[PDB]
Design a protein around this ligand. Structure first.
Ligand SMILES: [Mg+2]
Ligand SMILES: [Mg+2]
Ligand SMILES: [Mg+2]
Ligand SMILES: [Mg+2]
Ligand SMILES: [Mg+2]
Ligand SMILES: [Mg+2]
Ligand SMILES: [Mg+2]
Ligand SMILES: [Mg+2]
Ligand SMILES: [Mg+2]
Ligand SMILES: [Mg+2]
Ligand SMILES: [Mg+2]
Ligand SMILES: [Mg+2]
Ligand SMILES: [Mg+2]
Ligand SMILES: [Mg+2]
Ligand SMILES: [Mg+2]
Ligand SMILES: [Mg+2]
Ligand SMILES: [Mg+2]
Ligand SMILES: [Mg+2]
Ligand SMILES: [Mg+2]
Ligand SMILES: [Mg+2]
Ligand SMILES: [Mg+2]
Ligand SMILES: [Mg+2]
Ligand SMILES: [Mg+2]
Ligand SMILES: [Mg+2]
Ligand SMILES: [Mg+2]
Ligand SMILES: [Mg+2]
Ligand SMILES: [Mg+2]
Ligand SMILES: [Mg+2]
Ligand SMILES: [Mg+2]
Ligand SMILES: [Mg+2]
Ligand SMILES: [Mg+2]
Ligand SMILES: [Mg+2]
Ligand SMILES: [Mg+2]
Ligand SMILES: [Mg+2]
Ligand SMILES: [Mg+2]
Ligand SMILES: [Mg+2]
Ligand SMILES: [Mg+2]
Ligand SMILES: [Mg+2]
Ligand SMILES: [Mg+2]
Ligand SMILES: [Mg+2]
Ligand SMILES: [Mg+2]
Ligand SMILES: [Mg+2]
Ligand SMILES: [Mg+2]
Ligand SMILES: [Mg+2]
Lengths: 98, 136, 177, 48, 48
RNA sequence: UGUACAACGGGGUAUUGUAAGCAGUAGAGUAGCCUUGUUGUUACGAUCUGCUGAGAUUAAGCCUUUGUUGUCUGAUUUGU
RNA sequence: GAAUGUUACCGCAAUAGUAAUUGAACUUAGUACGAGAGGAACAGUUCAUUCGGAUAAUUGGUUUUUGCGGCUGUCUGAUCAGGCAUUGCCGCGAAGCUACCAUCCGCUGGAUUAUGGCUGAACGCCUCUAAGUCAGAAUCCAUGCUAGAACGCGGUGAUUUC
RNA sequence: GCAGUCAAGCGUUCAUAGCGACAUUGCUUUUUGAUUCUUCGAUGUCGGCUCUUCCUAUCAUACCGAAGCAGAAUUCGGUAA
RNA sequence: GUGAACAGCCUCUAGUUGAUAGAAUAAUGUAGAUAAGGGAAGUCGGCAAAAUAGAUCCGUAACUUCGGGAUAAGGAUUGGC
């Protein structure tokens, strides 16, 4: 049960909702509703239609706290040593100096 | 339908009543197909016998190689444009109505098929299945 | 589907398999790189944070970092990039590829482990494998052992022992630079 | 009350749409329980 | 109830709903829950 | 005289597609006063931008409601 | 809709109407039959035609929601907000209505006809028939379904005082 | 226009599977004629559109009998509107 | 005022606001509109209706009584500042 989005508008298309348009180049276009699907036919540019998903993304609107990071590092640091030389002789004999 | 067509067909919104003229989509020489009938269609005083995906019609060629003109022949609807709806609730429709010339037993006439083709059509017609590049 | 889980700190990797799609659904709509808590994947994995690295869909096609979508696209690929080993000079080729965002069409899901949970996963946290090779260039030996350019390499290098049946031998690298 | 859509897998060994999702229409009737408040009895008569 | 017993098969099939549409029906509904609506367009002038 | 009912007001829902006001170093450019420029300056310029998915309408046969106000005995008729 | 005391609620059913239709694919089965060429059917399955009764989750149509946005003239000094052009024009447009252009649903018992039979005389034999009798059709009667006799009916509640 | 009876003949053989001469018996009233009873102080005069209903001398659909019915297809017939 | 304009459409002067009224918005109409996919299959017939439409620029056939045909046909383009 997929939930495609409107290739124009941008909102989700729960099953059986809206229309689907197969163009000559065999590219598929789904529309939540008549509105976008018309505004699609009307040669309208998604980046010009203010409420569209593509408009807000291109015009930097309402992102706020995605406009910051998160937390995704870790830890490692061990000694699997060089292979074929007794991997124990590489932790011990690694006595260093400085 | 009737002969050569392996399978059933769930009902799809008829989009091509007789006299409709649709883009031909094979290398037959034919550019268009003009519907004179529909195989399988029923009778009701003043109903035009109409066509949909996977239907076998009877058609002629209006514009094409002269050896296809002035004679009737089978043909198979492959593109609708009249928005039909499937049992997964999808209201989908191609950009143009279109079909390919074929034989009684239901085999192609040309090498390949130019453009998309409905699943509904391919699933029904083994020979179409081959040539049809993209499907649905 | 299938999860190819890799432990980077220990060089481990096992291919676990999960049915029960409600379990899988944790991964859906998650981009390549997004982390995942383990308890949602199972209980054996509880705690274990998972970083999402790669994977494959039906028909085998590969994913590709930074493409979004949960579908296939046909890209023009160059040198120095994923899913394409060029054959000829400045050869570009147009090949299909799977989107980065996880969906129920994936045959395998390449995961890595970021953190450990409250259970030693069998062929993973328990078992270890050796970095198959060792330092070879000068100051790379020196900085693998931390020596201060004094301690003279020559013997501060690893030496692999290989038995000639009844003549066990000693072969080292070759210190360049 | 009204109606709505439903999705379900189809079990119908034979159909080209077997074991596949089908969106379907349904109607919701409001049914808060009924209270019993009497009992009436009926007889057979050769005229009803 | 039914005045006969339908062997039908077409009826007999125990069905199991996957999903039930709860988007508004007072027009072109988009979001199921008021949560889902929030988890999409986010925070507004009233709102937060 | 109450789980009342109504007029509004509130919240949900829904349509349109970003209100007026103000600001800006946006803007093809342009006027005038010199103190004739090492952003001279004050204006003025279709359109743009920000507050602003803003404003506006939303039961007239949508949903809802601890708020506000108000309303709750006129008429006629009937008998084995 | 007056009148069979008033008023109310729950029901019975005379009579009347009545409804479903046709095809194909799979499978049977490359089977039975045939030297071959050829080449079925009953059971089961999936769909379809014509017909009919609904219904508006979805999709489409409809637009005086004159609901929001835009445009043209002109008029209110400009601004804001507006007026006029038989709804000025335009894109979108909820609600409602609505479309095999959308979706849903369309029951099973009996009795018979033709016909094939059992038993069986008349006629020491014979015969489905004369007595008797079995099986049987898109028919018929029911079942179901729609009306409910405003002069067909039952059950039940309440029955007034200036 | 439709349906009979006799059965010489056709059907290799074989009158009546399916047909039928010479004759002869009928039915029908969607043909056309014959009539001129009714309306000339007016019954609006073709066809199509549309909608209903009825007839059966049944094209298809249900179940049957028959064949010059091996199968397939077809034909003749019964109950059937 | 817009515009080629005494055209249409809005306004100034002047003159009107005269034509039974109230309440609703069933069928069917008179007048005004729109429709998915098809495209005259409708019908005696495209009846009706839809399509076209200004101007600047490009481009233009047969045939001709050389005056035409001819806005032939076919294209582009058009606000604001
Ligand atoms: Mg709509
Ligand atoms: Mg007709
Ligand atoms: Mg020609
Ligand atoms: Mg904005
Ligand atoms: Mg009303
Ligand atoms: Mg309040
Ligand atoms: Mg008295
Ligand atoms: Mg009295
Ligand atoms: Mg029928
Ligand atoms: Mg076979
Ligand atoms: Mg033989
Ligand atoms: Mg209807
Ligand atoms: Mg609608
Ligand atoms: Mg307006
Ligand atoms: Mg406009
Ligand atoms: Mg201003
Ligand atoms: Mg005025
Ligand atoms: Mg006027
Ligand atoms: Mg129907
Ligand atoms: Mg019934
Ligand atoms: Mg008898
Ligand atoms: Mg009565
Ligand atoms: Mg006759
Ligand atoms: Mg003879
Ligand atoms: Mg014989
Ligand atoms: Mg006469
Ligand atoms: Mg007279
Ligand atoms: Mg008269
Ligand atoms: Mg008369
Ligand atoms: Mg009769
Ligand atoms: Mg014989
Ligand atoms: Mg008058
Ligand atoms: Mg009036
Ligand atoms: Mg419109
Ligand atoms: Mg149309
Ligand atoms: Mg339209
Ligand atoms: Mg034509
Ligand atoms: Mg015609
Ligand atoms: Mg004529
Ligand atoms: Mg004619
Ligand atoms: Mg005309
Ligand atoms: Mg039009
Ligand atoms: Mg002319
Ligand atoms: Mg310009």
């Amino acid at each position: 049960m997929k939930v495609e989005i409107d290739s124009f508008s941008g909102a989700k298309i729960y099953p059986g909702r809206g229309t689907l348009f197969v163009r000559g180049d065999s590219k598929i276009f789904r529309f939540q509703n008549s509105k976008s699907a018309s505004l699609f036919k009307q040669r309208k540019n998604p980046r010009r239609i203010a409420w569209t998903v593509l408009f807000r993304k291109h015009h930097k609107k309402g992102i706020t706290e995605e406009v910051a990071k998160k937390r995704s590092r870790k830890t490692v640091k061990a000694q699997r040593p060089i292979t074929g030389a007794s991997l124990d002789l590489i932790k011990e004999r690694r006595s260093l100096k400085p | 339908s009737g002969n050569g067509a392996q399978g059933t067909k769930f009902r799809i919104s008829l989009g091509l009543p007789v006299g409709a003229i649709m883009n031909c989509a094979d290398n037959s020489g034919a550019r268009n197909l003009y519907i004179i009938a529909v195989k399988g269609s029923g009778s009701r005083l003043n109903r035009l016998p109409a066509a949909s995906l996977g239907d076998m019609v009877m058609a002629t060629v209006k514009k094409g190689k002269p050896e296809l003109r002035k004679k009737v022949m089978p043909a198979i609807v492959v593109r609708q444009a009249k928005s039909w709806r499937r049992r997964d609730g999808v209201f989908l429709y191609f950009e143009d109505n279109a079909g390919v010339i074929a034989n009684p037993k239901g085999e192609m006439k040309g090498s390949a098929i130019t453009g998309p083709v409905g699943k509904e059509c391919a699933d029904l017609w083994p020979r179409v299945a081959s040539n049809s590049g993209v499907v649905v | 589907m299938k999860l190819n889980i890799s432990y980077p700190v220990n060089g481990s990797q096992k291919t676990f398999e999960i049915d029960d799609e409600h379990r899988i659904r944790v991964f859906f709509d998650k981009r390549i790189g997004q982390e995942v808590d383990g308890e949602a994947v199972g209980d054996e994995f509880k705690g274990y944070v998972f970083k999402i690295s790669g994977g494959n869909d039906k028909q085998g096609f590969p994913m590709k970092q930074g493409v979004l979508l949960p579908t296939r696209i046909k890209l023009l690929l160059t040198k120095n990039v994923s899913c394409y080993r060029p054959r000829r000079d400045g050869e570009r080729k147009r090949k299909s590829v799977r989107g980065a965002i996880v969906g129920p069409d994936l045959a395998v899901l390449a995961l890595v482990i970021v953190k450990k949970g409250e259970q030693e996963l069998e062929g993973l946290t328990d078992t270890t494998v050796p970095k198959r090779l060792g330092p070879k260039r000068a100051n790379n030996i020196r900085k693998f052992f931390g020596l201060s350019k004094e301690d003279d390499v020559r013997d501060f290098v690893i030496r692999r022992e290989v038995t000639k049946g009844e003549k066990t031998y000693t072969k080292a690298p070759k210190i360049q630079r | 009350a009204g109606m709505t859509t439903i999705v379900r897998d189809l079990d119908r060994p034979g159909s080209k749409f077997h074991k596949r999702e089908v969106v379907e229409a349904v109607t919701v009737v409001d049914t808060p329980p009924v209270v019993v408040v009497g009992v009436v009895g009926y007889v057979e008569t050769p005229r009803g | 109830k039914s005045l006969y017993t339908n062997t039908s098969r077409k009826a007999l099939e125990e069905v199991s709903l996957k999903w039930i549409d709860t988007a508004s029906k007072f027009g072109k509904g988009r979001f199921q829950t008021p949560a889902e609506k929030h988890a999409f367009m986010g925070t507004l002038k009233k709102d937060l």
